[PDB]
Amino acid sequence: RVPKGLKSPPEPWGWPLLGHVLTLGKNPHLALSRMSQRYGDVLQIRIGSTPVLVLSRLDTIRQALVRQGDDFKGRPDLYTSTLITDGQSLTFSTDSGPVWAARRRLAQNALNTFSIASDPASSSSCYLEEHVSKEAKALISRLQELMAGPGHFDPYNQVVVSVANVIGAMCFGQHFPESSDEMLSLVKNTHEFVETASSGNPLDFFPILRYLPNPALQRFKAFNQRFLWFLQKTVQEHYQDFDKNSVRDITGALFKHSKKGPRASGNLIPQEKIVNLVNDIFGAGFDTVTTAISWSLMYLVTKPEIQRKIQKELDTVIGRERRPRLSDRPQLPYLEAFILETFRHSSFLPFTIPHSTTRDTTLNGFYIPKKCCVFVNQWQVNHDPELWEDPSEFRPERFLTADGTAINKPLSEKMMLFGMGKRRCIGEVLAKWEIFLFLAILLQQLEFSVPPGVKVDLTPIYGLTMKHARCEHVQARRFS
Ligand code: HEM
Numbered sequence: 001r002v003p004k005g006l007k008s009p010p011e012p013w014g015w016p017l018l019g020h021v022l023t024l025g026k027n028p029h030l031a032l033s034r035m036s037q038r039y040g041d042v043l044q045i046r047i048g049s050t051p052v053l054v055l056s057r058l059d060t061i062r063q064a065l066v067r068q069g070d071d072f073k074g075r076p077d078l079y080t081s082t083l084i085t086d087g088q089s090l091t092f093s094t095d096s097g098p099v100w101a102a103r104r105r106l107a108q109n110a111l112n113t114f115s116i117a118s119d120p121a122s123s124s125s126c127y128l129e130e131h132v133s134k135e136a137k138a139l140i141s142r143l144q145e146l147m148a149g150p151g152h153f154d155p156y157n158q159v160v161v162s163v164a165n166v167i168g169a170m171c172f173g174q175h176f177p178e179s180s181d182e183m184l185s186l187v188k189n190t191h192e193f194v195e196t197a198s199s200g201n202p203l204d205f206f207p208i209l210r211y212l213p214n215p216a217l218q219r220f221k222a223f224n225q226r227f228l229w230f231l232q233k234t235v236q237e238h239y240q241d242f243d244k245n246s247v248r249d250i251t252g253a254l255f256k257h258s259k260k261g262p263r264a265s266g267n268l269i270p271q272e273k274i275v276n277l278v279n280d281i282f283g284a285g286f287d288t289v290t291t292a293i294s295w296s297l298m299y300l301v302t303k304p305e306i307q308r309k310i311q312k313e314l315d316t317v318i319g320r321e322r323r324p325r326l327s328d329r330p331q332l333p334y335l336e337a338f339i340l341e342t343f344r345h346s347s348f349l350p351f352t353i354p355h356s357t358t359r360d361t362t363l364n365g366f367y368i369p370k371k372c373c374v375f376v377n378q379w380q381v382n383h384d385p386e387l388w389e390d391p392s393e394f395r396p397e398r399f400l401t402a403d404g405t406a407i408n409k410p411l412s413e414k415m416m417l418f419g420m421g422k423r424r425c426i427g428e429v430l431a432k433w434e435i436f437l438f439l440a441i442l443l444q445q446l447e448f449s450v451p452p453g454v455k456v457d458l459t460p461i462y463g464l465t466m467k468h469a470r471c472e473h474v475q476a477r478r479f480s
């Protein structure tokens, strides 16, 4: 089982049949961070009888995902993943050869065309900035409306709407049904997806579990069926009002490409695997950004001074005679550091999506067989005692330069939330720019808080993306 002369990664003692599952508990990232602090940056655990490699140090993770990237770019064949959309997602499917590579590039390019690349019709900004500006204003209006009435709101719920509007435009243009209760019911409930498609879910390691009545699982299955139906219906409509001489969104750009015949290793890639790329773009893009923006607002509600510093900087740099813009990003050091600290401290992607090895290899001298499931603990990297001052504390200042006039780029680089290597997030820049512009436009006009005495629980709920408990008492007020 192991070649002559080599040894396997360090493995803690485990229970028969169970392996280390009881140790992961409700917060797998916290438990593995402790287990790694004892055994190493490269260890294996066992869930049920399935071996799982856990990587926890930034150096080791870079060695595996970047330098041995081709060995670590696989996705494991998990049960939960078989239930995702059409079983053919770019994110979750097990293919990681030339077809995955070609689909990723087409996804990435189409996404870039309609987001961060400048817009033709426009004279000065990219599509993203145009959509976000519009949606951030309308969000402000919606928030003032709610304050003039019930006098409070749920930040997560209002953020869902705006974010869904932005990514839906990019994906489907005018065909996106902003009013659809079918889509709103879906985007408000991605916790049904995220809670089940997370690292170490017992469903993926003990086949018995899937035969038992399981409401979380049934909700995962129904969410996925409803998600796929909505996406397919929307592309279908789209298809109807589509001309190759006027591509205006991601769906149309993928249609145009599929029509020309994209290939991989000399072979045509089936049209269905090209057009279904908006399923990954919309799913990942909506949920992540909504979670990030909601965590940021909650941080501000719970840290008035930080919120105040952010506001002081916008006044000083932009004034109050115009709204913030993307081109103001390098000059708004403190807001960028706020965002970076929202990412580090929450580590709302505690783990990257699970990886799998594509061939037998050795990592730091340890033998790892082909098709070994691999978990990468981003929360551990981001809370490493040896890597950061007070890991548990929320401090935007830790990312600022000595004179606090810019972001310490070298240190920003040790904060891992978008993966690394062959599988790293294709919407990273897009996400950073959208979160920035949303918060800048927002905070230039509104100050968020919760009434005195009202408690706010900021404990994250474990999942692919970690959510915070719902708080429906937040308030917003303009300010002199
Ligand atoms: C704060 C926001 C975001 C975070 C923290 C984030 C995080 C990540 C992470 C950790 C992965 C997994 C990498 C791996 O498996 O090793 C990933 C992949 C992915 N993300 Fe992002 N993401 C965010 C925003 C976006 C946006 C805005 C989009 C889409 C428009 C998106 C698109 C995707 C896609 C399609 C993949 C799968 C790529 C592949 O499997 O080749 N993400 N992201």
Ligand SMILES: O=c1cc(-c2ccccc2)oc2c1ccc1ccccc12
Pocket (backbone or CB within 6 Å): 084, 085, 089, 091, 092, 190, 193, 194, 227, 279, 280, 283, 284, 285, 287, 288, 353, 464, 465
């Ligand atoms: O909520 C989701 C989060 C995520 C997600 C993906 C990567 C990182 C973080 C969240 O993606 C999806 C979500 C929902 C549906 C999806 C369908 C196909 C592919 C991905 C989907």
